Every structure is written in structure tokens, then in C-alpha cells.
């Protein structure tokens, strides 16, 4: 914060100013008389209001939907023998970072929890210049080159006539893509997974996606894929939850990552890269130069380098957040490029679209992109110059400046340099290369290595989105191309969409599988940030003070309990009104809070002796109970409370429901093991 | 689109062409060898992704979420003796216009059914100009003077640390800004009833809010309001019901309107004004410049002047409707201003903002922004220049081009005049008018017109909103301002959120009321474009058949019958995977669909035996029903369907629920009354 | 066609004082009088093979071949003859492009030519701010525009087609693909080719900057080549 405090403006105990340091008022209009018309020579109107009308800047072209934070990451490590950047070369090296994570296709104000591939951008400050690695929370990508983006996106994003539907790859278009260009599959899997609706930005990993080089000073190379490894665990909704998520809070992935930072309770990752070697290109099956590919951790492991932790918000989220400006070409000596179509396609794309964002070419000199590192170079001018050169001589090669600022290379000044061995071989073509051609048996890969309750999910997906494809002719190409990765899949989907089920093609059929592939399987690492919702009644004051007992259990592990109620009373954090199920990991129905759960609560007649309330709308305790363990989420009842389960023909012997006499230890330690699983599969239907 | 298919491109059976007409491939980079690197010389690539990396504009500063459509309006009559405007000249004259409709915080994927204000700008390109009412769903703004915006809106957009959240007022700056500055309370109550929540585009109506000037050839002049009085009716949601919308369907509004315009039922409004005297502007207790007052229909009657209907869908949604760019300051002969400040310094923000959006001065050259009036004019160049202007000598006044273009006034040429008998009297001054003083008599007028029902939707609505302001200080001056209004209002709101309740302040209590104010209460006009969700099963083939019968007897009326079943199968229009009760503004259940409504269905295990399907989440069917129910909806059963409503505890003798032997005439009759109800406010709890 | 004409320094600076206009002045009123300046059109016709066979490297921009090696075959002939009606709408806002080739024509490896191709697109979006600058009037095509480019500020046009992408079968696969075989498509010359390692050099083939300098001063009258010192 030493560097970034040098732009920050203090508005405490201050009078009011125009942009120039003039005090001025600004909250009446100069007028002739006292019901006249407005002047122009009101220089404070107009100054306020030009300020007003100028706010907005173009959403991002993809990725407009997304959230910032800063942090710091750690080396394990002295990584000289692996790579010459600067600041992976000491054990305990420490570099600021600024993060942003994000969806792809919805515009600025579109729902946080839209089913999406997610953005996980990472930038390092490093003392030999800024790096990024722009990535997201898939290891694959739709396509392989750069130049079908435009297709990809206009596919996905709303129709061209109407710009319907928002955030939302369920409508023809997107499928028609899908189906014409199978290299899709892959990455259409993962999104349909748990993966496409995380919990929240902490309880995902990150990718580079695109295999890098690692160069040393001397010239020694390695091909690497980049991971930022979760310390949180993988966290994911169903779908019916994020979409009743996306009604009740827009903002919920964007909450829980400042809210957890406000608290405390940083997250983490740790950078890691799959080490592979130039001659392994080909000789695993596949081309590493093929961004619709992983390497299965079975056959390269992950070496982990060092730690990444967010801990410091935004000030202001204009100025950072909406401002920041990642490249892949922001990168650094000691890190090259690969030949991979889509990664040398994007080069292009990110140093361009900045002139679209800032409206001129000084992007860099915004103060979330400047490096904490010298800048000394000829280039000059353009709009918005913030410097002043004092070089009037600004070419190479110079007498007149003394030859200064010198060249620096491979030898010299610590330069950025190619990796020495690379070449070039073949005629120049536009061509798609044969060793990207198979697009199928990887997507098997990870359709087997799922548990079958997320096979189900992806089943679910397919069919609700598919299902709102107009077109006959792209359900059917659909399906195809689905029976090519498994004939169970293309069935179950086909079943739901009046398609006739497909005969098996078998040509990349195969029953391998990767380890923890999915996002459903396996317990949290850390329950931080999580949320029980206590479900008490002011009516019975006790209900109301287990909360705080249940709150001081559960401390420890990080995990805030909210007191709901019928109106804001002394301990009440919320009332039933402004409360969800899709607030809370878990959902308690506190002793004495039982008579608010009442069966007929959602269709009895609200009439005059009736006693319903009008502090929420009919039914909303007893919904929020049901919806919690339709959606499998913990559930549990204290004392009386487990009436209320009795209400909503909850059963206490199934699987993440738990009861006990108080909130003492006994019960905080299930609800600790029931958060720890998270989400209870079944009561998730399978196709038999 | 005669004018407009002019700048049509149609990309039908033709080759690909690059942006300078080069037949082009567009699939594959250019690279060195079959996996090389991408080669700087690929202009092809260059100019594809340069294209994608620009597309984005700034979103508009407020309105960025907004949807429009292309119209004609007629004059009723010869208005000759009311203003000289040529578009108003004549009985059946007609004139193209286009219309957008919006909300006013959300970025431009927000969803549709926010709570908000909502924009209603009507442009009429006439014969002498183009010509914009831009206008409101509410006759009454939040502030009376055009400096405050930027506080207004800064108060209400979301937080600047951390951009949360998004499209609400329900958080602490907005509700500090409302309570510090009362002249809020009016528009402030408009919002928080159905006014705020309306069901779509087609079932509100329009206000220009401001007093404008009528003026005749002769210099005479009239205070006027304009209204667009809507000829479908008012239909709006309660808030749970709005909420639910968002998270099913962000694009619910826009879609309405585009699927009414393809359906052929072209929604339509009434252009009328209230007719004042310059002698008025005092008269009535209140101020006529004050733009937070009504001039109530009982003291000055609505007149008549023509209808707009709107029949014709974009058919680019970019081009035409992103890009249309609204100005108060599009005046034409026959209309003057008011020195109500805030019309006053809109008038400078319309013109300044295009600059920001269009990125240069040339933005009325747009096709959507063009008039469809001869262009005669000395201003030259600027970025963007899309004609050529064959006059070089491009000043007045000139012998060069022999005094052309001729100046046009009140007397030739037609030219704009300012009313000529307004004028300027006082001291210029900052100074809010000792006239505007009054902000809470209007309120109380509004709040004392409501049914009961819309009371508590009002109530309710504050409640939700100001349970999750945090400041305690917010909360109790929120509460001091709504007792001016009403000591009801107040001590219902405070209730919820822990403020203790307030003793009367009379000042400005009264009982007076004006008509029909309220979103709610009156019955529906037409029922063109309204839906009716048929619950059916595949496994009952009867069941599905009883949709076409239905629809034969509800075609007459404009309603659609939608039929939902478990997978697609042939007559079904969609999934219950896919459906919600937020899409259909009546549910019927089909006579042999009653299986699926099993009063367990929501808990039960998925065993098995137990048989439950993966075509749907658990309970959906019962869901949908409830949901129906619970939100107010037209419910109705056919035949043995009538068990679901048991199932639900739902009984046929509430109003709004409905059975019916089979699909007749008889049927459709009661459906045909509960939708023109629309909704049924007796099962909403109303405070003792 | 009209012969080459030249001032001397001198004479150069006193018209700078006196017709800060006169080349363009010169233009305009040949066009209004009618006399309408003329060029032909001619290229040097060499083989693929001629790239270094004259002692010189044929991607050197700063070597000419003689006309008495490759002489110039003549093409066909420009007439300038019409100015426009308005300066800065017309030749204030032309955006030339070595990067607006078509069929028939490509590239070679002279870096000059390779990294101006990047500069001309880049540098309109400052010119126009926008990318829309394709349509303005003076920089439009005279033969149809189809492809799947959207939006943008400026956009003067209204595409029809709601879905703007390939492959597609929403729009029955249109625009179609255009190649060397079908639509008359652009091509790279098939056999281009690449080899070597990727580095940041300068040729030994480009060192000599002496020996064509010595050329040109040889070749001068007595008076030119005092003109130069
Ligand atoms: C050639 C087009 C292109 C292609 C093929 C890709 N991208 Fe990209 N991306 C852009 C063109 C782009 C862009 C248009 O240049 C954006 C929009 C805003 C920006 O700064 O860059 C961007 C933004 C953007 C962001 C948002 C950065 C932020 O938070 O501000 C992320 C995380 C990614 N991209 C990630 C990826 C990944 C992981 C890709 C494949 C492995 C990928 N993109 C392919
Ligand atoms: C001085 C600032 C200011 C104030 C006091 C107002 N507006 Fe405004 N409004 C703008 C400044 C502005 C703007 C920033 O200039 C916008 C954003 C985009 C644009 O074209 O104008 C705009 C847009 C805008 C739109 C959207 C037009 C469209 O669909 O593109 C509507 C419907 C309104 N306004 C309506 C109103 C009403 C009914 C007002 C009060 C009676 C009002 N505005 C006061
Ligand atoms: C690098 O490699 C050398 C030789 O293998 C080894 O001795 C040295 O310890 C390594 N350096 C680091 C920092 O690991
Ligand atoms: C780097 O620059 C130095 C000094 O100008 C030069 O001698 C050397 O050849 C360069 N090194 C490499 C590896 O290109
Ligand atoms: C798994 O992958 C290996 C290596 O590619 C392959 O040889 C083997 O046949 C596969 N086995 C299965 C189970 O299909
Ligand atoms: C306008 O008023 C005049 C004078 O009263 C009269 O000629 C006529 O009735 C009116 N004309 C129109 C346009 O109705
Ligand atoms: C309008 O212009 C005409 C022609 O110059 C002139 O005679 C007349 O006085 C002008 N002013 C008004 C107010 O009509
Ligand atoms: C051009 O496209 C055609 C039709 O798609 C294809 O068959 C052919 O291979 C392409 N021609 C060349 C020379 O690349
Ligand atoms: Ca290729
Ligand atoms: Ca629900
Ligand atoms: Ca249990
Ligand atoms: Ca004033
Ligand atoms: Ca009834
Ligand atoms: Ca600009
Ligand atoms: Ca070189």
C-alpha cells in the first residue's frame, strides 16, 4: 500500500473543491431570480455534471463481470536451476499482487452465479517487471486458435436482433457452435460440471491453461502448464440453487470474497507447474500445444513453487478493480512463449482492446498498472501523458542522450530474450494442425472420472439447456457429437429433448480416468467464510440466544452463524423477509423458533383472527427449510425445533440432517462435519 | 424501413469479405508450418480481432438497461390552436418514432424486474425535426434541481469500494440520501408500490414529468404535462415474485415486449397533455416548475392528442437500440421549455453524455439518430464525418454561397422560437425557491389513494429495504420523514426494523385522494400477450391434448397456452426442468398430470422404488403451483387434476382458483376473469 | 508523363515564405484547368530465385534494382482528375493500408513491409477513434461488404444477420468461407516458406549501405551532385 497511497484522495472533515482546488457549493443551479432559468455561466453545474456524464468506460469484451484483490505471494524457493525470473529466485521472496476473478460472457451487472467458465487473473509487481498470467478456473478452452474467438463469443453472448439472453449459453446460437466445432467438448463438460457454478471465487483453482516456457539465464528451457492450487477445497452449487441465487444476490461471489478479506480470513493458492520437457511435445497422445488438453496429473505431478494470499480489498473499485489492465504479453525474462494457436492469437488481442478501455494509449500509466520498477524508454506522447521525459533525444542509437537508455539482452541488463532453440520449419499455411484432431477422448476422461451424481449434473445441464434450443437440426448435431465422447451420456440427455437415443460409435470410447477431477467429491479443506443461518423467532428469546452459543462453537473454524428473525431485535442479524436459503452453507432451526414452520403456512387465508404475519410473505420460514435440503445443505433443528422437521417431512435419519437437545460442542461438531461435506448427493436423483 | 433499409446489410448466400470488400477466409491463423507461430503479416487475423476488441461502448450513465422498438404515432387531430408543432397539424397525420424502455441504476445486464424507476423516451422523427419526449413510468422525480443527480445517482449505484450491489436502493447510501434530502419521499413511494415492480414494458404508463411550453405560430402559449396513457393496463408484481423473476429470467421485460411486437399484438398508448395557463404555475398550492408534484386528473383533465403504437422489433439490437442516443434538447417549433431547474440542466447533460458514448461529435449521423428532415447546416468536420457538405465557404452571413443557408425564426422559415413573452426578474442567485418547500403533502395524497393491499406492498417493501441498512442513524431519519407522512406509514415500517415507533407530526397530514394512482386495483384492459402454463405429463397423452383445446377457446383474447411436461415430446412446449411459475401469469393443472403433485415429492429419498425422475428437480411440479399460488396468480385444475390442488392444500373455493370439468368454453370463461384480475390481493396479510 | 522538376534550397525557402500552398495549390488548379496529371503504372518483373543473385538482397528497402539489370514493364496508367468537394472529409479522413491487399498480390519478408502492415490498422483507431473507420465514405469499398465483424462505435450500418459467427447452420453457413480454390478468396503464396531459428538480428545480407549510396552520386549531372554537398 506504500506505492498505490501516493494517488489516494482523503475526503474527511474537508471542505468541497472543484477538480482545479477551487471551494465551491453544488447543490443549487445559478438562476436569474429565484424561479429563473438556469445560466450557462455556471461553471460549478457544468464542471459537476460533464464529470457525471463521462463516468462510464466500455465494459471489458469479455470477462465485464468480475471482482479484485490484492495480495502478496511468497517463493518456496531458489527456482534459478528452473527459470529466471526474478521473483521466483529466493526462498521467502515476497512480490505484490493484484487478482481478479470473473465469469466470461454476462455484461457489467449480470448475476455472479450465471453457469460459466470463470476468469483467474493474477498479476505479480515483480522487481524486473509486471507479469501476468491470465487464466481461468478450467484447464481447457473451447478452441484452438485465436482467430475463432470473435465466433466463440458471438455464438455464446446474446442473439444480434433482441440481445437475448443475458449471461446465458442456453439458446441456439451457442449450441450450433458446440456441435459445428467438437474441439468445444471438453471445456462444454467442465462448464457443465460444478465447475461452471462455483460457490464462491475462493473455492476454485486456477490455470494458465496454455503450456509456457521456463527459460534459464543460460538458455535452458522447460515447458510448463501453470496451477494455482486452492487451499479452501472446491466448492459448487446445483443449478437450481445458483439460479435462485441469481434473483436473491447478484452480488454473491463479489460479497464473499470482500467479506471474507474484511474478516480476516485470507484465501490462498499455491502456484504450481506440471515440468515437462521440449521433447515432450507430442509422445503423450496428444499435442501439448493443444489448449483442449490437460496432462493428467497421473502423468506429469504438479511442483509447487510458492504461495499466493489475498488480504487487502480495493479502495475505490473504479480506480482498481474496473481500471486494471492484464496481458499475457506482460511477461517477464525467464518466462517465454509457445507455439500453441490460441495463446499466440491473444498477444494481440490484450495490448489492442486497452485502447478501446482507456480511450488512448497511456494505459499503463493508470496507477493499478504501473510496475514497481524503473520505466526508462523513448516511447512518448499520446493522449493522457502523465510523465514528464526529460530526454529530448528519445532514439536509439543516440550520441546526444550518451547512448542511453542502453540495450539490454540475454547477456546485458538482464533483458527479456526468446528462448534461444526455438525455430521455425514448414511453408506458411492457414491450416488446422493433424495433431489436434482428436476431440473426444479427453472429454471421456473426464466424463469418467466423475462421481455419479456430477455425471447426473452435467446429464441435468445439458438437458435444461438443450431443451430451450429451438432448432432441430442443432439438437441432433448436438447429440451426435455427444455420442462420440459416450453413448450413456448422449442417451440420458437425448431422452429429455425428443431426440431418438443414438447408436454407440465406439471409435474413443475408453475407461481411463484422472484422480479428483470433478467438483463434487471431496471435503473442504477450511470451512472459512461459511454461513449458518440460525432460524429464530422474537417471540421465544432463547431461540434467539443459541446463536451465540452456537457462534462461539464455531468460531474457530471460521464460520459466522446469522440470527434470523421476524424484525430487527437486539442479536437478530436478519429478518425472514430479507433472508434465502441461498445465504447459508447450512440452515438450524433453533427451540422455540417451531411454530413459524407450520404446513399450511404457505396457502392459509391471511384473514383478520388468523395471526399470520405480514413481517414476510406467507410460507417464507418453512421455504427456506425446504429449499435449504432440496438444494443439499446441512440442515439441523435444536430442542423443540425438530417439530419443523416434522413440518416439512424432513426425516432425521437422512444424510445431513442432524438434531440435538442444544448448541453445545456434540452438535457443533456435526454441523462442523456436515459443512466439511458441504453438499449431501443423495438427495440428488441418478438416471437408472 | 423504407429509411432505414438503406443502411441494411444482408449476409445471405454470399462469400465472407473482409471490411474493404477482399473475399476472406477467417478460420485458421496464418502460421510458420503446421505448428508454428502466428505471423505478424496475417492482416486477416488483425482485422477480425481488432474488430472484436472495440466492439464494447460505455453503457449510458443511468438507463444502461433498457430495451426498444420501432413505432408510428397518429394525431387525433388539427392541434393547430395549441401548438404550431407539425407533427400534431393534422387529423390522421402520422409519424415514425422509436421508443426505448428502461430501468435507471442497473448496468446493462442487470435484470429486467429490479425494483426501480422506469425510462419510457419516445422519439417522434417529424417532418421539422426529430422530436424526444424522454420520460418516466412515474409522473414524479426524486429531486428538484439537475446538480443533485450526481448525488442522487451516486447515493443509489452501488458502493464505491466495492461496487455492491447491483440495481437496488437496498443498502445505507441510498436510504441516507432519501432521508437527508425529503423531496425524495414522493417518487420514493411511487417506487416502493407496484409502480416500481411492473410486469412489463406494455403495462405502464409515461409521464414527461416536467411542465413544458405549448406555443402557437402567434406566440401563445400553454403550461402543459404530457402522459402516455397505456391502452393494455396496469399490471405489476409483488417483490418475492420479482425477485424470483430475475433468477429465472434476467431478459423477462425485453422478451415480453419482442415477443408481443413478432406476435402481431402491437401494444399501444395514448398521447395526452393536461392544459394549463401561464397563470397556473401557482395556483394550485404547489408549484408548476416543481417537478416532485402532480397536477391531479380531478383538478385538470387529461386531453387527448393521438396514439403511438409500437408494431416493429430492431433488427439489430446494437445498432439501433444500444446506439439511439435521446435528448430533451430534440425540440421542435410548437414546444418551449420551463424553468424547472431540474428540465433546466438536463438539457446541458443529453448533449455532453453522446460525446462519452459515440467517442466524437457525429453521433446524430447515425442511421437511429438521423432525422428524416432535410439537413441544412454551417457545422463542419469532427471524427466520424459521414457526409460530405459541398458548400466550402460554412458561414454566415456570406455572399460566397449567396447567403445560404438562410437564417429560419419566428417569421420565416419556420425556425424555433423561445415562447416571447417569458422573462427574467431577480437577483441570480443560488437558492432553493421558497415554492419547492412542501415535500410531504404529495406523499401523503399518493399514500391515502392506494387500496389497502398496496399500502402493504409499500410497507413491505421498506421493510425489506431498510432491514439491511446498516447505520442506525439512516434508520431512525428514514423513519422521522415517512411520519410527516403518515404516522400509520412510519410506525407499520418501523416496526421491522427496531426503531421505536414515532408520536404524530400533523403539518402535513391530510385525507384527500385522487383516482386510480396505484399500480393496483382496476382490472386488465386487454389480455394480449399474457400466458397460461398447462402442467401436464407424457404419460397422460390426454393431459397434453387438453392445451390445444384450451388455446382454440383463449386464441380470441391474445392469451398463449404453454404446455409443460417432463421431457419434449410432440405439443409440448417445454420442460418442468425449464419452467417456473414467474413465466406464466396463470397455472393450470391438466386433468391426468395429478401424479406429479405428490405432497411429499419435495423430500422424499430417491430410491429405486421410490421412482422419482431425473427429469426435473425434486418438487418442481408442486413448485410451480405453490409458487403460482403463493405470488397471487390465476390458479385453475382440470378434471382428476383438481387432487393437485389438494396435495397443496390449496382450496377451490379462494378466489382466483378454478375448476373445470374439461377444457371448454365454460373453462376458459373463468380463466378469461382471473387474468383480467390478474392478481388476487386476498392472499396478501394486510396489518391490523 | 509530365518529366521531373526541381528547386533549388534557395528557392525552396522563399516559396515556403511566400505559398506555404504552392505544391497543393499547383494540383488544384492543373484539376480545374483540365490539365490532368498522369502516371503509368509499371513493376520490375524478377523470379523468386533473383532474391540475392544481383549482390544485393531483393528485401533490402534500401537498395534499388537498376533499370539496366530488370527493366520496368508497363501496366496501365493513372489520371488524377478530379478534386474533392470537401477537404477534410475526403482527403483529411483517407486511411491508406499496405495491409488492403487483394487476390493476386502478397508480401515479402522486407521487415520494413512486415511491421508496417501491424502500424497503418493500429494507427486509424487513433486517427477515427473507433474501429469503424472502413466506413467512411472516402475509405468504403466499391463491392460488398459480408462478414461477421460487429459493432463497435460508429457502426453505420445495421447487420441483418443475428448470428455472426462460423461455422453455422443458423444462417445456413453464410458468410461461406473464401480461398484460393473457391470465392476467389485472398492467398498467402502457397509456397512461402520458414526455417530457422526465431531470433532478433540483422541480416548479413543487409551491410552494405555504401556501395548503392556511391551509385546514385555517380550517376549524377556536375550540378546535382553540388546540390547535394
Ligand atoms: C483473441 C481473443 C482472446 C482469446 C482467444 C482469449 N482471450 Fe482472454 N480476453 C481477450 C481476448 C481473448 C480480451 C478481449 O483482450 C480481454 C477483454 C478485456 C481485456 O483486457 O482482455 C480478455 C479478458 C480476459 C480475462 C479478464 C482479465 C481481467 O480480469 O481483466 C481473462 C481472465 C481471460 N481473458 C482469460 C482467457 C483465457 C484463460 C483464455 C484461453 C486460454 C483466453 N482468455 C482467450
Ligand atoms: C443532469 C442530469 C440528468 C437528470 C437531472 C435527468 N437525466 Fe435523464 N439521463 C441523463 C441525465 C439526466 C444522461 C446522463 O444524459 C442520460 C444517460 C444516457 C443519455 O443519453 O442521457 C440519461 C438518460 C435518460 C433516459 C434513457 C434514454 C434512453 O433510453 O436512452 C431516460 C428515459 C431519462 N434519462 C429520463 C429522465 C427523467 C424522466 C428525468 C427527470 C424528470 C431525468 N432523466 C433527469
Ligand atoms: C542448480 O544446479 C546445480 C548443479 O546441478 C546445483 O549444485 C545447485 O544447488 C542448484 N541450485 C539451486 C539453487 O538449487
Ligand atoms: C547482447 O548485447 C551485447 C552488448 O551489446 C552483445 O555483445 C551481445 O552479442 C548480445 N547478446 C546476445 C546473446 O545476443
Ligand atoms: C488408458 O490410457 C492408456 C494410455 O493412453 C491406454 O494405453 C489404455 O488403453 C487406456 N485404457 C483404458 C482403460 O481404456
Ligand atoms: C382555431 O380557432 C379559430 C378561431 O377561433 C377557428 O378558426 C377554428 O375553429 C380553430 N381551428 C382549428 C384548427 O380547429
Ligand atoms: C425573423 O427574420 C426576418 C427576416 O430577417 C425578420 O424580418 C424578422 O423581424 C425576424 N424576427 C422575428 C422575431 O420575426
Ligand atoms: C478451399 O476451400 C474448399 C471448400 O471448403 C476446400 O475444399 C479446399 O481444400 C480449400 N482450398 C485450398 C487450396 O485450401
Ligand atoms: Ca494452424
Ligand atoms: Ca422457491
Ligand atoms: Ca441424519
Ligand atoms: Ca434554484
Ligand atoms: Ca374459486
Ligand atoms: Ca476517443
Ligand atoms: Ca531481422
Redesign the pocket.
Known sequence: QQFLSQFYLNDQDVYLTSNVGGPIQDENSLSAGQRGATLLQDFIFREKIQRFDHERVPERAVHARGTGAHGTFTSYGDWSNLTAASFLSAEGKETPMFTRFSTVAGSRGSADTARDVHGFATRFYTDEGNFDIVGNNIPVFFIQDAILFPDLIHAVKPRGDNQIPQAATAHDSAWDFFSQQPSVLHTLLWAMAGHGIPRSFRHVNGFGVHTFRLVTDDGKTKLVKFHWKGLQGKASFVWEEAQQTAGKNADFMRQDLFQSIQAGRFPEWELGVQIMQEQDQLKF?FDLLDPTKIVPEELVPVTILGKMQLNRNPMNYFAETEQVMFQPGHIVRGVDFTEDPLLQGRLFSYLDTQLNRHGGPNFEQLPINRPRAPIHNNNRDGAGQMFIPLDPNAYSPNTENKGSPKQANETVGKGFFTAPERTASGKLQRTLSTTFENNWSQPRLFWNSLVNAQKEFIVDAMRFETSNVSSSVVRDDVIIQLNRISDNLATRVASAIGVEAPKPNSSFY???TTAHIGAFGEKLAKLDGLKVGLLASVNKPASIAQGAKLQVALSSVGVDVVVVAERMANNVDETYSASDAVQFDAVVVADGAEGLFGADSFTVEPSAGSGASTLYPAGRPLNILLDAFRFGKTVGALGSGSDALESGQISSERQGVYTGKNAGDAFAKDIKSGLSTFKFLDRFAVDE
Request: aromatic residues 0%; hydrophobic residues 0%; glycine residues 24%.
Open positions: 497422445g475408453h475407461d481411463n
